[PDB]
Write a protein that binds this ligand. Sequence first.
Ligand SMILES: Nc1nc2c(ncn2[C@@H]2O[C@H](COP(=O)(O)OP(=O)(O)O)[C@@H](O)[C@H]2O)c(=O)[nH]1
Length: 164
Amino acid sequence: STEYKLVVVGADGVGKSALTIQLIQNHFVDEYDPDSYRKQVVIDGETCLLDILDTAGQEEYSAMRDQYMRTGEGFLCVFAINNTKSFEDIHHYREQIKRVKDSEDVPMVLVGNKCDLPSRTVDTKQAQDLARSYGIPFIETSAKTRQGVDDAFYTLVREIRKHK
Ligand SMILES: Nc1nc2c(ncn2[C@@H]2O[C@H](COP(=O)(O)OP(=O)(O)O)[C@@H](O)[C@H]2O)c(=O)[nH]1
């Protein structure tokens, strides 16, 4: 079966690592010290291997971040629903991915994480309008309750499958 390399990007603290660890290990972590992990899953009846590359801890413009992005086939662009700044930063990460892959057509999913937390500052309509402007899906997640987590990563695999 095919292996899919998925890279998780977003501002520090939005939950890249907690999402990754929930996907792989089925546990929520209160802290993560920065990173790649593999797991076999079945998506739409089709077995595949996920290789998740977590950019947590990499400096904003590091050579290793660029290598991670070059290696990736699809990207999760994560913000936190309780952090307007991290939502405003999404364009930065999208631009970086486009530069590194040297393409305007890169499989991506927009992920609004921490949807369990009370203090929402980003509406689902704002996020869906950004996603719509990029032509990509939007998925709301909580690494803590597991809502949306599988759906985010699996939707990204579906996007890659549509790209090849
Ligand atoms: N309540 C809640 N906390 C989260 C969620 N995702 C991550 N966290 C927490 O937010 C902090 C940052 O998460 P981390 O995964 O290290 O963020 P990263 O820097 O983007 O990798 C930690 O204290 C995590 O427990 C979530 O969906 N809900």
